[PDB]
Amino acid sequence: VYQIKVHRKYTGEDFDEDLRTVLRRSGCKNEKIAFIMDESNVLDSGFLERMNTLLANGEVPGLFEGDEYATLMTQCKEGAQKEGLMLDSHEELYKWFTSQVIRNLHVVFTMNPSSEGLKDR
Amino acid sequence: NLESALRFGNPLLVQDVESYDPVLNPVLNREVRRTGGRVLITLGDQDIDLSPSFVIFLST
Amino acid sequence: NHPDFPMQIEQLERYIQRYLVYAILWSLSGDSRLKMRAELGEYIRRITTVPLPTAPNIPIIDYEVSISGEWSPWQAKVPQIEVETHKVAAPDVVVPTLDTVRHEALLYTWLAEHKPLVLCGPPGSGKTMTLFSALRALPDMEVVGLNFSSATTPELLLKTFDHYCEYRRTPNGVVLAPVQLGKWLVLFCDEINLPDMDKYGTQRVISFIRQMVEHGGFYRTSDQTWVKLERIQFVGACNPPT
Ligand SMILES: Nc1ncnc2c1ncn2[C@@H]1O[C@H](COP(=O)(O)OP(=O)(O)O)[C@@H](O)[C@H]1O
Numbered sequence: 001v002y003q004i005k006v007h008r009k010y011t012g013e014d015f016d017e018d019l020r021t022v023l024r025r026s027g028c029k030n031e032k033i034a035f036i037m038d039e040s041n042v043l044d045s046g047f048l049e050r051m052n053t054l055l056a057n058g059e060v061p062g063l064f065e066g067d068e069y070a071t072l073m074t075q076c077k078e079g080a081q082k083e084g085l086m087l088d089s090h091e092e093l094y095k096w097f098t099s100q101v102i103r104n105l106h107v108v109f110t111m112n113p114s115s116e117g118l119k120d121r
Numbered sequence: 122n123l124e125s126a127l128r129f130g131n132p133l134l135v136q137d138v139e140s141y142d143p144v145l146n147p148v149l150n151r152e153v154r155r156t157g158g159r160v161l162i163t164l165g166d167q168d169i170d171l172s173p174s175f176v177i178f179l180s181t
Numbered sequence: 182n183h184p185d186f187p188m189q190i191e192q193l194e195r196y197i198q199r200y201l202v203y204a205i206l207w208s209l210s211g212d213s214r215l216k217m218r219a220e221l222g223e224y225i226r227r228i229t230t231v232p233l234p235t236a237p238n239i240p241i242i243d244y245e246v247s248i249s250g251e252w253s254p255w256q257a258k259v260p261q262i263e264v265e266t267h268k269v270a271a272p273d274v275v276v277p278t279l280d281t282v283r284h285e286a287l288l289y290t291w292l293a294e295h296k297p298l299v300l301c302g303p304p305g306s307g308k309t310m311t312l313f314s315a316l317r318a319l320p321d322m323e324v325v326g327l328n329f330s331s332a333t334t335p336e337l338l339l340k341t342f343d344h345y346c347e348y349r350r351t352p353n354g355v356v357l358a359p360v361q362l363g364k365w366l367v368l369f370c371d372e373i374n375l376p377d378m379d380k381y382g383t384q385r386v387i388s389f390i391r392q393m394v395e396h397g398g399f400y401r402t403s404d405q406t407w408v409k410l411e412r413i414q415f416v417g418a419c420n421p422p423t
Contacts, residue, residue: 005165008142040143049330056328056371 027100028075058102130172195250300418333376373417
């Protein structure tokens with residue numbers, strides 16, 4: 001189980017780093033994770049746009065770039081070597097990471113029964 | 122000030138909470154952990170020991 | 182396909198007249214519910230003089246125009262295939278039906294000319310998967326799926342272009358073409374209306390799309406030169422704006 005510890009200074013990049021961490025913990029580790037979310041933990045619509053991309057694609061390309069992307073490639077390469085799959089190019093390992101996430105990551109959303117908030121969401 | 126109240130167990134009063142800071146969520150939920158003879162609560166990325174004499178009062 | 186017997190004049194007249202009636206039917210009322218399509222069919226039946234099917238209640242929208250210039254029902258073209266037991270409710274499998282076959286024909290017609298089209302309909306309703314089935318049916322056109330969000334920006338299309346295509350210099354000028362030769366790339370947008378508009382009622386993504394589709398290319402921001410699109414066409418889908 002994983003909850004994001006949200007405070008008043010919990011800006012966008014903090015959640016971005018947290019989502020990078022959970023994506024590393026799910027696909028690169030083949031470790032099934034339950035992602036606990038509440039709307040109280042939400043402070044802006046950017047959170048939900050990024051979750052929308054994640055849910056509809058199984059991954060968000062925005063998180064991983066530059067040195068972070070290379071570290072992801074190293075981690076997914078070592079994970080694939082551990083499981084028994086040999087891949088070299090970036091795209092195949094990225095698709096394998098996406099499959100690992102879509103099979104392991106589980107995102108849950110908790111909301112109070114607000115019909116107006118429901119249609120806004 | 123919240124750290125000082127949690128350390129010394131001193132009562133604390135808040136005059137304005139309309140701009141809520143969710144740091145109090147573990148405190149309000151009383152998410153305490155009993156490790157050894159210590160009572161700890163996580164605040165953000167740092168862990169704090171609780172004193173039973175501590176009490177908080179939020180006001181509007 | 183008939184070198185020995187090319188069509189004669191009367192067959193051509195029959196075929197083109199029936200196809201024209203079918204064309205008004207599927208173009209003027211192509212973006213409305215079934216009752217209003219039937220209303221247009223009844224109105225054109227009252228107004229036209231072209232020969233029409235004698236179906237007591239079946240609208241001519243259910244009937245195609247054969248290559249022999251005859252009204253043949255779409256039901257005959259619908260096969261009865263049996264999927265494997267392990268492939269039930271699979272994402273890939275599509276079971277043909279009246280709507281599926283009619284939309285397949287429309288997609289074939291509108292992709293032969295590479296005119297972009299938008300699949301507007303309620304969530305689900307077999308929009309995305311019918312489009313994918315039509316695309317995979319044609320071998321030459323590959324598929325790329327871009328999920329447009331409320332913050333969609335043209336740099337996503339630029340990223341897709343530099344990922345799947347390449348810029349080359351030609352006597353006419355610099356040209357954007359897919360890295361795969363002799364292939365027509367399809368940029369599917371699952372939610373083309375989802376991107377928000379600016380404070381001035383303009384969505385940058387739709388303007389960029391219309392710019393390239395009507396001008397046959399776009400602008401590369403690095404050196405600010407006209408770029409000619411080759412072997413690139415778009416297909417869209419979206420929920421109703423309401
Ligand atoms: N002709 C068909 N053959 C097989 N499945 C169909 C057909 N028409 C509709 N469906 C079902 O309806 C659903 C359509 O959802 P989908 O088209 O993916 O939604 P969207 O277009 O909003 O992405 C699919 O899950 C599919 O199983």
